[PDB]
Symmetry: C3
Subunit: 625 residues, 3 copies
């Protein structure tokens, strides 16, 4: 019966379309849409599981580099998981499965489909892997052995069989993630497998497979620190690669809508950003609205006391370096550099596998310095640290993992500012030298803006407030960041006063002793005939008081729903004591007082408070290391 024939396997081949081709050929050529749709559906599901403390069953492919090949170092463990070669003490799938749940709360289950020396053709034809593993996401890395001619693999065969593997795992219900092959000389020798896998990356993008640039992971690392032989990593290299893959997942890198961090990006807890993926690893971050938050979003990132809380911010850094700024408060253990989440210590050179500037002349060896106490100058913007290297970065903000935190830690905002790598510092004065920029905090009294057609009356410059430049802020854990007991913690600045008459005064604004936040100005350069005509400059470090712009209950009850606050109610001097000072959320101001000897001259004053700040720093950050 033709019916049975139509219902048979070859039924689609007996029906031809208007172009002369059979229906079966049309279906076979156009099935990439089904694979693409299934792939991104499963990828969206996997992203949801990553960001919602879910569970991921992960199948890990392909060859020796996925298998954790290590036959050179003494940090090896016997061959497991269907491999034949001695494995490093920690490969990338296992570091991924130990890292992703730790940072995001998403449980990871490993299905190791990795054999050393295997090709894409070998993986597609491997007897043990012919069954559906029923996992959620599959990471595929096959280029190194393919380009070496292993098992007669050619570029066409490699590409065909990697496409076949992608389609097979998509049909198996697995989200296919394609990895640019990792390992070996940071691109030394112009390896063919990079080109092969680039072609395969584009063919994978045909199916909507996200590409994890694993070659990018080791670009800014020390080769000796991450490699066991000329091609394969040691334990630390594999661990860093797995951590970077997990960072890609918690960044939202599985999604097509993901955008890398290219400019200054400020995110907080509970808000969804396509640039920085935030993961609450244990679900105990209190993302409630409180007026006590130091940001206008009022979204307190409460890392509550007594609860082991882990706050994770993952993103792709599209620059050679970035500066992490945060409105943090409390004892927050911060890890953001690879090689400090995991280091077994088996090899002494693992610690030198951190992301470092490749330019020998632009940076010394990177001694990573992270802050754990961000409780000083409470309410102020804190310098969390720096991220070196282009790629996927994770900022781990966690409290005591045993739940022994006595006070609430707050992550009110995390700012990732891509910075040029030579203009970045590990901490404030935490490296040999900081290439800073002379930043001018300028104020005009009276300002010419908005006047128009009319000359404002000249004013006497007797007192003014200026936001303290970054050099004026100290670095230290907790209250040690305040220069109150150690007035050397702040860099003396310059206050340059200009007027329309050509009268110029330059003061050296340095802190006056170790009792309170008081600054005293020394006259450096002035245009006056006598130095006795120069006013005495005294300043104090203070924060702006809180005024209520719109009080809740003004147009109904209910009906500016919340309180719109500003810190423009006046400047109050701070003594550096958090128990008696106001919150520094209103800003760190240097409130200058000019004690003129005679009557205060009236004029159109331009005040420039000079300091050195990091490149592009929006707000002066207090250092906490």
């Amino acid at each position: 019966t033709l019916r049975s024939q139509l219902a048979s396997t070859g039924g689609a081949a007996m029906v031809k379309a208007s172009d002369g081709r059979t229906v079966e050929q049309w279906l076979v050529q156009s099935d990439s849409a089904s694979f693409r749709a299934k792939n991104m559906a499963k990828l969206a599901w996997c992203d949801y599981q990553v960001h919602n403390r879910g569970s991921l069953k992960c199948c890990f492919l392909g060859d020796s580099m996925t298998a954790g090949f290590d036959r050179t170092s003494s940090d090896t463990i016997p061959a497991q998981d269907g491999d034949w070669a001695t494995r490093a003490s920690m490969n990338y799938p296992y570091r991924f499965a130990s890292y992703l749940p730790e940072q995001s709360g998403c449980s990871v289950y490993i299905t190791m489909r990795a054999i050393s020396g295997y090709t894409a053709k070998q993986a597609y034809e491997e007897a043990l892997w012919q069954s559906n593993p029923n996992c959620d996401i599959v990471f595929i890395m096959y280029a190194i052995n393919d380009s070496g001619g292993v098992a007669g693999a050619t570029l066409d065969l490699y590409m065909e069989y990697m496409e076949k593997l992608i389609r097979r795992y998509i049909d198996w219900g697995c989200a296919v993630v394609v990895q640019r092959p990792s390992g070996g000389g940071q691109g030394a020798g112009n390896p063919a497998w990079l080109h092969w896998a680039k072609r395969m990356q584009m063919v994978a993008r045909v199916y909507g497979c996200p590409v994890f640039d694993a070659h990018e992971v080791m670009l800014n690392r020390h080769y000796a620190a991450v490699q066991s032989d000329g091609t394969h990593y040691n334990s630390m290299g594999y661990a860093i690669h797995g951590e970077k893959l997990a960072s890609m997942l918690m960044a939202g890198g599985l999604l097509d809508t993901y955008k890398p961090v290219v400019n200054e990006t400020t995110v907080w807890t509970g808000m969804m950003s396509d640039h920085i993926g935030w993961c609450d690893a244990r679900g105990n971050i209190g993302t409630g609205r409180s007026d006590g938050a130091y940001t206008r979003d009022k979204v307190t990132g409460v890392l509550q006391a007594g609860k082991a809380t882990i706050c994770t911010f993952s993103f792709y850094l599209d620059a050679e370096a970035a500066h992490i700024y945060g409105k943090l408060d409390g004892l927050i253990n911060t890890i953001y550099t690879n090689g400090y989440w995991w280091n077994n210590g088996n090899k002494p050179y693992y610690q030198y596998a951190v992301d470092i500037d490749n330019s020998f002349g632009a940076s010394l060896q990177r001694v990573n310095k992270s802050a754990n106490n961000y409780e000083g100058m409470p309410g102020s913007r804190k310098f969390v640290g720096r991220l070196i290297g282009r790629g996927w970065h994770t900022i781990t903000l966690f409290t005591n993992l045993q739940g022994e935190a006595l006070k609430d830690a707050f992550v009110n905002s995390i700012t990732v500012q891509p910075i040029p790598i030579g203009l970045s510092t590990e901490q404030m004065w935490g490296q040999d030298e900081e290439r800073r920029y002379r930043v001018v905090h300028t104020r005009r009294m009276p300002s010419p803006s908005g006047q128009g057609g009319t000359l404002p009356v000249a004013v006497a410059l007797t007192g003014f407030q200026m936001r303290a430049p970054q050099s004026f802020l100290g670095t230290g854990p907790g209250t040690n960041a305040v220069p109150a007991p150690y007035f050397y913690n702040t860099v003396p600045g310059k206050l340059k006063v200009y007027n329309e008459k050509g009268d110029y005064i330059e003061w050296l604004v340095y802190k006056d002793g170790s009792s309170g936040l008081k600054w005293k100005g020394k006259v450096l350069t002035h245009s006056f005939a006598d130095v006795a005509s120069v006013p005495t400059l005294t300043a104090y470090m203070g924060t702006a008081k809180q005024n209520v712009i719109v009080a809740a209950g003004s147009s109904g009850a209910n009906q500016p729903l919340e309180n719109i606050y500003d810190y423009n109610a006046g400047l109050q001097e701070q003594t550096g004591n958090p128990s008696t000072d106001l919150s520094w959320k209103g800003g760190i101001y240097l409130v200058f007082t000019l004690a003129w000897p005679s009557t205060a001259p009236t004029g159109y004053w331009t005040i420039e408070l000079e300091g050195s700040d990091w490149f592009g720093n929006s707000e002066s950050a207090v250092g906490c290391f």
Copy 2:
């Protein structure tokens, strides 16, 4: 007959493919390609209509937040459009339909498919919405009620039915735009609907649906200013969300090729950029080539006199803030901050719904200041303003909407420079304090560049021109920006002169009185034994004269087709009077004259004209507020 059976509904199920599955199952799994292709075809059509003064029929989905739910504030209007709950006086679909035609000229027709408390399953099964509305684009927002368990909605049911809605509206010929759900505490409480709709965003990207991050819209706003209750917006919040959606459309955000503004992006009228989408709302922008344009592209953005002209620049800002620089001239009414296109004034706290820095200590309450008169220092780069917050931004450059503009306004270029939020200012001296950077305008006479092997002869430093740093430029509407009548409008700078002999002179370059653009230098620090040996420093603010690089008609007639101009013909002093001065298109130069007392010493001079400029400012911008 098997034929009738094949032609029947179940005909595809009776034919099986080579894998054992029926042809019908193959078609059902692989139909995502058709939906994706139709979706982006309609999205491209919708983008064309947005950017070509077209017409869009917009169907608005889904729940209470799309419906404009407001049952708390007194700014409510009775339930319309098939909803049951009291609506805010302006929801986001209606603000979108009032904003998109106003800014782009694209007529918007509303089909309100929004009911308060509705889920994706309820929308797919809603009796009134089972018919094809025959609209062009559909915006879908369903996560809040789904995650609350409304009508038994689960995550799987939610995802299934949102995918069903997307496919249904794609088949109906509607461009499907997916919105990250908006509303409530800026991410407070770690809402489940954010995660659900993130998963749904990825599944929508399966179908090529652009994702409008509506959660991102309220991240940098005051919660009390935009919310009516804990989850739903008031009139201003909905208005800002609709304006942001329209900004996404006029940015080109409907297209996969759209790229966010990540670095300094300069665009003008009539040119197509994948970063900044420009919309001519009324078709009356004269985008002709004239040598009178202040830019080398010669594309004059003539907002012609007597014509109501609206120039719109929309884009996604991938930074926490940006600075708008423009080569504008004339009376251009500028609106670029949300909350100033629309504000009914019913609630006094609506004005505090502007994009503000969440850091209390990095910014006071944002008092938005926009310039309407950019006619001063004509030809110079103008500081248009700042954009705060990551997301979609619109820059509206419109003249008198009644056609009563007497002179032609010119938009020769608009530069959007992503800047760190703390380094941004609303206007020049328009906020409490500007965190500026000390910018050094350095010139070497003779320069060592390009010499090689040979020592150039030492030259006498008697006169030189330097581009005026930003601090040297004033702010004011029209001619009020020129410090000619009010010499306090400019900040005095420093001219530091170095030579190879170790001779150093530091002048205070301040403006000499209120008659003309003349600057006079006061000697601050010098290395000479006697201050009488220091030359007298006099400067004037002037522009470079026009020289013809290649005159049209030189190699044929026809045949450098146009005139290649440069402004390097010499420096001419300007008096600040636009009726007698040259155009400032040649740059704002401080032309210094050194009157040495004895013969002018010869040497290898390094001249550093110090000033304070905004972070990353390419060209010194004149302020116009």
Copy 3:
């Protein structure tokens, strides 16, 4: 027989699906997946061929602008390649086919499918183009004649037939690349074809076609320099467009995973980046790991002596300008600006077709200056040049093309830093004026970082090293960049010394004569009562010595696999002679010595070495022009 009928052309139409539509209609609507998959598969293949010295058969479409229409200038050649109109002496397909193999080694074969005045409908119905050309990639540009109503072309007909052309060329095995139409007034007149082709771009993105923004190419150029008539280019405009298309290809712009350069991006040879595509044009770049590399990646980009080596870095610049920094060494001929790879010189105004800032007041006419000798201050970061304009940029690092290079040239890293256009310089002091930023190199002895709770002992400030700011570095070819023989090559800086006691000293740090790299400080401003109490400041320019962090062979042999090096072994003075000095890879340090007259006061010293640097410069770059 129904069987024959099913196997007939209309067989699919006789089988209907469950929705009532026939199987044929389902196949016709959902075939976009097959076209998309084939398109990106061929695009990945084409990208592989571009980056692996492959071969591309390129079919060039569409109208007069693809055909190289030029009927106005005297730089025309008779009509070739099936066109009817006089062609410019170099159109964009031929410049592309001469440029892509030159820069990437990928052989290009031209199939000219371009006729002047042709539309998309005309191209689809052209008799000569009905056959499959069996080429690899097709570039399509059809909007100008379509919007003019040529051959009755309407927007719907245009869109339909361009989609038909895209599908036809995808079925023909050709990678379809869609070009935003180029030509005419930089967007003058608000041309309709820009909008039409924007719609067509989105419909092309339906099929995964990469969009080459050719309208973006001429945005920052002089119109007179690139145009022959009001719409069509001259030879130079077409050449620049073809070079930009080739730059798009070597950037990896054919791939969906490509990301533009938005922030500082550092890449080297042999590494794969999704931001900067690196092409080894002749396969002779030695990308081996050597400790002699100036970067921590140790990937030497050896342009070996005696071999014609071409190193190409292509990328999309998502800013108005960028600065090219490189750790280069040797005689590397650098071309990075369009109009300098190709210029036939037939028209004198072709040289003014370079990417220039459109703001007349922010830049003079761009006199491009590129460095060929980067052998000075060996090991230091070099300022390669600047890239102006948003779009696709190529950095060509090639040695003597005849193989007469005597020494090995090294490309250890190329850094592309997007910079604001007004803050960019062509070379160090290579333009009229550099708008620099006052950068403060700050060091604290003792630093307050990491101490906590305890006051460190005060130290005497007798000697310290500081990384030299950019103003301290000279510019010149090879050893001419060293200020050793011509001490005017460096800009004198300021060393500001602060302490906790309010003692401030400001020195003028200028070079002490022309014998060696010795700097001497002149006291400018001090807070001391007597200038005799100020210490004598002497400095030398030196590099840090090499210390071994982890020596290879420490934990096994094999087993920190390589040597982890740092340059923190001490500071050694350099004389500027490359034959006797150390490599400058350890950094360019100004090592200051303070000779106090009495005993050296002890205190908490803040040292600020002030200089002027370019905006966002990570490491001080030596200029090489």
